[PDB]
């Protein structure tokens, strides 16, 4: 299952301390992401050396030209630049490409790459210029030869010219031998580097979205039968089976699905038989998105673990082979595909968020998830709801392909070019938006949990008050049974604003049943009306206070405790320090969502994710 | 002519000292750009012309709210919650702000955009339809002139509730809102107001909604976008004339009658400029001389010959969109519209930025169109088969093995164009049914303006590279004329020294004139290269025609391999027609003001270093000086 | 106002009998559309006007060619081969046509587009810059007036060498070129020429190039596209008011001051039209009465699809009007090369064959069309959903049995399908420029391709307009039935209250419920004790027992009887007026011409289980009427008197 594969990627990202760089052991997108984001992770180039040196001296024995190429390719402009995370990742990938002994590069130059990587040194690289990565890679090479015009970063602040940057880590500017200049610039390092970090994030966020569908089911009062194994066995898309298998496991023995079943047993013929598509159709929706992301990871990693340069030196057969391994078409096209899948993940989220905001589609929940009770000065998550539309709309825009804009380039020599870095940049941008949408969604579902648990508590109060007041006013058993049904049946949030308001749903149902009990018991009539009138007075004096106290008690601080999404709720509420959103909470929606987004951005969200999925398969 | 209009915008941007905000005087995209980019420009809110109508509308809203008139967003809930009613006039407004402070810092909206949005919101208020207090307007003026603006999240607007809520958040002194003071000071909102001598406002009726219910951010970005569009448009138009001069084009393409007979306003006006720029050109003199020898293509390729037709829809789109954006700038984008004169609140949708949104989609396509023209012209310039004498990659050499010239820049131009064309896909097609399906149509104008801005960034790169290449081409053309004269001299003097006939002399002088110098500059006396080939062909031709002559010819060929190459180097080393050209301001600007020279293996400056200087000049606006100089006298 | 200009275009499209091509009087998109769609419209080439300058130009080029003057296309090779020279005048022009006959038949360019392109090439020649012979122009006139046109492949142009080569191949009688004569007969080109009394032409100097070097096909499709764009835009603008009437909207959204204060020319003009259409509207009377009952429980403002329509329409109106001018400039231009200036003895080398103006504007129009589609889809969505309907039933299902009636749900799904594809089509074509023809055409417009896609976009918009108008005619009937149904419930409740001997307190309370409760929420089973009518009645009855708690025990008896006797009379009388309706406020509405046209001229009625006609059959009729221009009659009648 792809789920266990992604869990492996997350574990690899966390547990790795050193990355073994030789021509045999596969570097994954998790490894690339680890090197880029965790500076304690080091590059270990293990001597492989036999092949490199054979190739290196073969090229030299067989034969200023190289440094003229670098000068030529240093043609970028600073407007925006490629992040140090992408550059160092590109440096890792260029280094790994040399380990196959096909490039003719010196081993000493490879050691320098390792030395610069482990010392947080990377050149400043302009964002644009590559049709896929001559211009960007020329800046790594420019650093290695000590071009004063080439500025290098050491850490997060220090910016010094290339010669100074080399000297601070005990290195001397290289004089380029034969083919070395070309071997440094020919390659797919930058495109595949961004694609690597893109694919790691795509894998984590995909699993996150998959998992959170179950949490949506819990809070929206969904029917879990949508994930039933037979439905998906009979339409057996690998991603349709595996997503539903996850959801089935997440929703089995769920205390919220207990409440859901109870909800649809009351006025069954007045409530929807099926859920809407955002939930019910999610396994079918996720299916292609799962497969696109999984298959693209394989493609990107194949590129990471390849000799991408030209010519391919075949020193064993005394031959130099002329081809086009510098062509990043594999990454470029798949980056387009992933961006469309990411946009599809965004649409799923947007659709679910929309259902959650609207009282007509939320099965009991209040509009905009406003707690109120005063809805006139509490508009809840409306701002976030608007933002979700803005997020999705830009996301769908971005998912237009880049590979369709191939220009005949470089004196019509490069009449097909991949544009791989451009596309990967756009997929990265798309995932940034997706991170925002997931943050907003998880914040909304945590709010919905609070609202559901308070709903159960409030209905219990109403039931108790109406039960005891029926006794105290000496109402008949027929009357008591009618009024207690209304207490259970009517949605609490439809009247929470003013529980005893005559025009709001609680008293309407009460007045209706009161008329029905007078007609049914018209067999003492006068005393019945006396006792029913007293019921209304007692309710108008006691009920509000009883409901308010419970709400205030709940806000001062249980169904989630037995739910598999408890880790997510605990993480957002306790570890991040948040609470039910209301007019009495001084924190802005920004402040609550920012906390969640930052936890998604820096990978902390994987702790409750793994905790949630512990025991699965 | 649009050319006059664009020059007017450039002058206005440079010369404006104070932006008058009186609710009568139109604010142009040049005024918006001036405020955003020049800190010395100040906002002058005039009480004389609009204070009266502001306080009338302010009083009206407040009195109607206290009486309990059923007006949206003052006594009712917001958006899809418009069925709810309230008498809590102050809390209703600040609950809307709490709600809309819902952005996430991931990236930010620039200070320039935020400040432009503040100017545009203030301008909306001057019309006296908003019901905002005059004191709030004075605070916006005070914050603008004191360089105070909130940090705003980039995304959230479907068009500009969320981004405007941060301007509102500053005004009411929210702790969570961070504000800038200049460039290096960032403090919470309550402290920011304290430093400029302001108290946090207590929102009165409608004031919250009045602050957030505008198109300020979408129109802000669009204003700077449209100013830059006009500037960069005229820049591309003009530089088509420089391309003609260096590529050896035929200025006949700009002939009045061609475009008179296909009368697209943008086509006529672009051709008019180009005809004027090329009328007394010294390079066009070299062009006519070039095509007189061995009369070579009869017509230029489309990148030049078709420029007036190509620019036509691009000129019109940019000109029309400038009007639409300025109309939005000078409008009350707010709801409800308070009609105090007739005692009623009017419910509409002036908050809808669809006019900006849809036109931002059109301009991005036009900017892409301009980029394709630049890429096409650049492509021609880099290829010897299409450059009519110039060397490939514009490599000076002479040693081409260690000089690949502008190949790096040529590659970059493809990457620029490719991403540019991608960006020009529409945003207005991705409308989602938003905000509890209340906003089932929404403009997405800010998002679109942001993308058009990104397109213009890329276009700036392309113009910078194009101008650099063409300055390289100028030097290469002038050096070509000087090299040919040297070769012509050497051949002429050596023919006399060897005592060659008049038939022989004429044939060898013709070859020296006809053969493109950059084909044999790498090794002038190489027997396999074009000069010696044509010489050897003429040497056999003269023998047959006149049939010790062999001895005199053999001496000529031998003396050439000892005298020619050294004299060609001499004139080249010295160098390491534009004076009569109308593009002298640009060449003089790039070479002298930016301190650059002929690109070669002997010039140690990287293409990055040289093109960076040109880009910076385009970005900060210094490039308008050589542009205005170049266009002096055009009416 | 753009409204007047569009009305003028429709009038000219209807009234014109002859298109005069004289090189001085402009041809509008209406004339191009008229020639293509109305076959009684004939072309009148005026020799008196322009044949002098044509023959002057014709004899100039021919005399220069025989001398051996160096001019492109007449003595020089084409495109990137402009270094090859020749004195073989006849063959040079034949060889160009030979290599340009390179299209493939998979689909084809319709006769409407081809004949329009023929007209536009003919018109281009009248300016006397091409060097074509007058007799060739005469032949173009005769071929048009005889309904003879070549079968042209759909694709091949980057903008229109290949498609125009089939018009030229027809003129020289190429056997491979197939020509159609009217709707039925397809014959080879030389056989088609003899049937109209023409002999195959032999191309002289520049003639082969003059026939192929135009923007005729791109501008042809763009002309009929822009005519359709203007007609359909006004139709969409108009039907926003009909939407207001049926959705129970506040006409306030179109108040002149709102739009004066935000003066986008399209915003003011669209609101101006809407204000006029809704002034003293009978449906707006009902709307005001609707929001007066339980005012503080209903929305203060309409949703965006109506309220924001003038703001939405603004850039859409400006785009469509601006592109009409651009297209008409191209229609009335000499799009050829070289441009022969016989006066000053010069052949001017330019690029008037570049359809970039039409290309870029087709992209903009498609985006505007997509925007028009989204507005319609948004309005349609609100109409289908009862929470946003202001009383109308879900899917506009009449019922009353909603279990066997799902109303216009099928159309609702289709509307989304239409809009989805429409938004996809509005991506630009101009951004996909390849360096073409041996890198000679490193910029090219792609105008014909772009125009083809905007045309496809317009076809979808018609589907949407057809569905939108049909739904609103359904809504009209539902509103008028609703009004009549509320009258019934009121009278029944009123009379029964008296007959049961209920107090005036009770009678007034129960009558309020009869008015306040939306009738479509309980029409399925009025007397159902769980549906909103009896809910409100049970509420009011109990409050009466409380308020009057004079006799009290007999009150319960009379109230119990009221409920019981409501089951005996109410359903029968509600059913009666419904069946009576299936076998008034629209009569005073300005949208009456649209309702009459759909209902009686096209022969339709209320959609229910009792109506045998499918949604397809009803919408088809409306679509056909929009397609063939019959929709302009109820449009012009509706707008009679405006401004």
From Swiss-Prot, chain B:
Annotated Gene Ontology cellular components are:
cytoplasm
Activity profile over pH: Optimum pH is 7.5-8.0.
Result when mutating residue 351 to X: Abolishes enzyme activity
- Which residues carry out catalysis? 72
User: Where does the record locate the signal sequence feature?
Assistant: none
Keywords attached to this Swiss-Prot or TrEMBL record, sorted alphabetically, are: Alkaloid metabolism, Cytoplasm, Isomerase, Lyase, Phenylalanine catabolism, Phenylpropanoid metabolism, Taxol biosynthesis
How changing residue 213 to A affects the protein? Abolishes the formation of the MIO cofactor and thereby abolishes enzyme activity
Q: Does the keyword Cytoplasm apply?
A: yes
Q: Which reaction does it catalyse?
A: L-phenylalanine = L-beta-phenylalanine; L-phenylalanine = (E)-cinnamate + NH4(+)
Q: Which GO terms describe its molecular function?
A: intramolecular aminotransferase activity; phenylalanine ammonia-lyase activity
Pathway it works in: Alkaloid biosynthesis; taxol biosynthesis; Phenylpropanoid metabolism; trans-cinnamate biosynthesis; trans-cinnamate from L-phenylalanine: step 1/1
EC number(s) on file: 5.4.3.10, 4.3.1.24
Q: How is it modified after translation?
A: Contains an active site 4-methylidene-imidazol-5-one (MIO), which is formed autocatalytically by cyclization and dehydration of residues Ala-Ser-Gly.
Recorded hits in PROSITE patterns, A to Z, give: PAL_HISTIDASE
List where in the cell it is found. Cytoplasm
List residues binding (E)-cinnamate: 213, 299, 305, 335, 407, 435, 438
| Gene Ontology biological-process entries | alkaloid biosynthetic process; cinnamic acid biosynthetic process; L-phenylalanine catabolic process; L-phenylalanine metabolic process; paclitaxel biosynthetic process; protein homotetramerization
Uses in biotechnology: Could be used for the stereoselective biosynthesis of beta-amino acids via amination of cinnamic acid derivatives.
Q: What is its main location?
A: cytoplasm
Subunit structure as annotated in this protein's UniProt entry: Homodimer. Homotetramer, dimer of dimers.
**Family stated for the protein in its record:** Belongs to the PAL/histidase family.
Quote the function comment for this protein. Phenylalanine aminomutase that catalyzes the rearrangement of L-phenylalanine to R-beta-phenylalanine. Catalyzes the first committed step in the biosynthesis of the side chain of the alkaloid taxol (paclitaxel), a widely-used compound with antitumor activity. Also has low phenylalanine ammonia-lyase activity and can catalyze the amination of trans-cinnamate.
Q: What is this protein called?
A: Phenylalanine aminomutase (L-beta-phenylalanine forming)
